[PDB]
Amino acid sequence: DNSYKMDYPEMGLCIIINNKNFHKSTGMTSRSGTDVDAANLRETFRNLKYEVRNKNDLTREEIVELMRDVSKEDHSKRSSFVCVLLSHGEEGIIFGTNGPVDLKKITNFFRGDRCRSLTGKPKLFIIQACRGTELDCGIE
Amino acid sequence: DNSYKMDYPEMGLCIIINNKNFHKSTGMTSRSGTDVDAANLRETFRNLKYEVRNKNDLTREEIVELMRDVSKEDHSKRSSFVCVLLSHGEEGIIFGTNGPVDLKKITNFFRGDRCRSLTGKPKLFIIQACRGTELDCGIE
Amino acid sequence: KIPVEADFLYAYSTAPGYYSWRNSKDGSWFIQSLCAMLKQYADKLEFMHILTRVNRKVATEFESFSFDATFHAKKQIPCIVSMLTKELYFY
Amino acid sequence: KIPVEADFLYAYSTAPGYYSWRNSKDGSWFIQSLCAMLKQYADKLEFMHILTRVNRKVATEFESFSFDATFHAKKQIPCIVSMLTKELYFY
Ligand SMILES: *C(=O)[C@H](CC(=O)O)NC(=O)c1cncc(Br)c1
Ligand SMILES: *C(=O)[C@H](CC(=O)O)NC(=O)c1cncc(Br)c1
Numbered sequence: 001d002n003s004y005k006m007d008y009p010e011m012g013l014c015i016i017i018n019n020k021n022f023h024k025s026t027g028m029t030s031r032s033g034t035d036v037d038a039a040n041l042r043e044t045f046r047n048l049k050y051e052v053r054n055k056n057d058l059t060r061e062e063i064v065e066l067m068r069d070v071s072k073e074d075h076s077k078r079s080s081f082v083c084v085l086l087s088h089g090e091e092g093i094i095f096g097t098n099g100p101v102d103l104k105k106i107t108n109f110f111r112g113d114r115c116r117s118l119t120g121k122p123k124l125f126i127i128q129a130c131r132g133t134e135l136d137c138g139i140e
Numbered sequence: 141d142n143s144y145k146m147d148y149p150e151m152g153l154c155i156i157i158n159n160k161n162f163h164k165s166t167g168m169t170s171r172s173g174t175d176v177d178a179a180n181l182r183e184t185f186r187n188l189k190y191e192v193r194n195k196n197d198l199t200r201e202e203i204v205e206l207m208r209d210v211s212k213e214d215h216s217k218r219s220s221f222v223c224v225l226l227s228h229g230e231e232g233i234i235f236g237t238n239g240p241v242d243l244k245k246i247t248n249f250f251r252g253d254r255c256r257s258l259t260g261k262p263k264l265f266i267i268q269a270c271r272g273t274e275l276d277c278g279i280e
Numbered sequence: 281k282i283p284v285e286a287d288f289l290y291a292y293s294t295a296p297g298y299y300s301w302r303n304s305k306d307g308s309w310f311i312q313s314l315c316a317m318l319k320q321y322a323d324k325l326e327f328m329h330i331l332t333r334v335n336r337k338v339a340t341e342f343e344s345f346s347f348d349a350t351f352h353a354k355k356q357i358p359c360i361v362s363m364l365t366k367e368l369y370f371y
Numbered sequence: 372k373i374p375v376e377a378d379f380l381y382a383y384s385t386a387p388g389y390y391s392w393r394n395s396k397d398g399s400w401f402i403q404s405l406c407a408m409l410k411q412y413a414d415k416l417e418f419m420h421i422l423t424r425v426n427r428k429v430a431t432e433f434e435s436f437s438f439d440a441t442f443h444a445k446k447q448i449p450c451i452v453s454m455l456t457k458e459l460y461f462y
C-alpha cells in the first residue's frame with residue numbers, strides 16, 4: 001500500500017483562519033480580497049467532504065488556543081487534517097491580528113507524538129502569506 | 141502539455157560534489173561513508189543517462205567557481221540539470237572543505253534570468269547535509 | 281516507529297523569502313488557483329500533481345501591475361513542501 | 372514570462388532544522404534510499420511519487436543506534452521542496 005487511507009468515516013477537519021483586519025498597533029494593512037479566498041476555500045473543501053470551520057480575525061493567542069483545542073480532539077474516525085492560514089507573514093511566521101505566531105509553534109500541536117489521533121494520516125497546511133519581501137521579476 | 145520535455149539530445153548534467161575531508165580549522169569531522177553515496181549516485185544517474193561529474197573535497201571557493209562555470213555552459217541540447225551536494229551543513233548552508241557556502245548563492249547561478257539555457261527546464265538539487273541539530277525521536 | 285515530523289505537507293503560496301500576491305477582488309493568486317485545480321482534478325489526480333498544476337498556473341497566468349515601478353510586473357512561484365509518506369488521493 | 376525561481380526542486384535528506392543521518396559503511400539513509408527508488412521506479416513513476424517512496428522508506432526502515440542516549444533511537448523524514456511547473460519523468 002502506497003496511498004493514504006482516505007476511506008475513514010469522514011474526510012476530516014478543514015480549519016480556515018482568515019485574518020483580514022489587524023490591530024492598528026501592528027501597522028498591518030487590511031488584507032482585502034481574502035474574504036473571497038475564504039469563501040472559495042470553504043466551498044471547495046466542502047465539496048471535498050471536509051468539515052469546514054472558518055475563523056476570522058483571530059489574535060495570536062486565539063490562533064494557538066485554537067490549534068491546541070483542535071489537536072486535542074479525537075480524529076480517530078477522520079482521514080486527514082487540513083489547515084488554511086490566510087494572513088500577513090514572513091518566513092516561518094504568520095500574523096495573528098495582534099502579533100506574529102511562528103509556524104512551528106502551531107504545527108507542533110499536530111506532530112506524531114502530540115496528536116496521536118492523526119499519526120500516520122496526512123496533515124496539510126495551506127498558507128497564503130508572504131514569506132518575506134523579495135520580488136520575482138520573471139524572465140522571458 | 142503537463143510534463144517536462146525530456147527528449148532533448150541529452151538528459152543533462154549531474155554534478156555530484158562529495159566533500160569528505162575538511163580543513164582542520166573548520167572543526168568538521170570527516171563524513172565517512174559519503175564515498176559510498178557518491179559511487180551509488182554516480183552509477184544511478186549514469187544509468188538514467190546523465191553526464192555525471194564527480195568533484196571531491198572542494199573548498200567553498202571551488203564550489204562557487206564550479207557552479208559559476210557550470211551555469212555558463214550551454215545547456216541548449218540538455219533536458220535537465222541535477223546537482224548533488226554531499227557534505228556537512230545547516231539550514232540554508234552546506235560546507236565547502238574550508239568554510240560554508242549558503243545554498244542560495246550557488247542556486248542563483250541557475251535561476252531563470254541567470255542561466256537562460258535552462259529556463260523552463262527542471263533544475264534538481266539533491267542535498268545530503270544536516271539542516272541543523274534537532275533530533276526526531278519518532279513515535280509509535 | 282516513524283518520524284514525528286512525517287506525514288506533513290506545507291503548500292506555500294510562494295517561494296521562500298518572497299512576497300505573495302493578492303488581488304483585492306479576485307483573491308490571492310495562489311488560493312484562487314488552488315481552489316480551481318482542486319475542482320477539476322480532485323477526482324482525477326494525486327495531490328502532488330494537483331499542486332504542480334497550481335504552480336504552473338500561478339507561474340504562468342499571473343503578473344502584478346502597479347503604478348509603483350518597484351512592484352510592477354512581478355511574478356510568483358508557489359512552493360510545495362512535502363514530508364508526506366504516501367500518495368494522497370481525495371477519492 | 373515565468374518566475375526566476377520556477378522549475379526548481381530541492382530534495383532535502385531531512386526536515387528543516389533537523390539532523391541528517393549517515394552510516395559509515397552503507398552511506399546516508401537518504402542517498403541509499405534515493406538511489407534505490409530511482410533504480411526501481413525511474414521507468415515507472417513521476418519524480419514526485421518516487422521521492423515520496425524515498426520518504427516512506429527513510430521514515431520506515433531507518434533508526435539510529437548509539438551508545439550516546441542523546442542520539443540513540445532517532446528517526447528522519449526527508450523533505451521535498453518543489454517549485455516545479457510540470458510532472459517530471461525520466462523516460
Ligand atoms: C504579505 O505577507 C501579504 C500576504 C497576503 O496578504 O496574503 N501580501 C500583501 O500584503 C500584498 C499582496 N498583494 C498585493 C499587495 Br499591494 C500586498
Ligand atoms: C550534519 O551536517 C551531517 C550531514 C552528513 O554528514 O551527511 N551528519 C553528520 O555529521 C552525522 C550523520 N550521521 C551520523 C553521525 Br555520528 C553524524
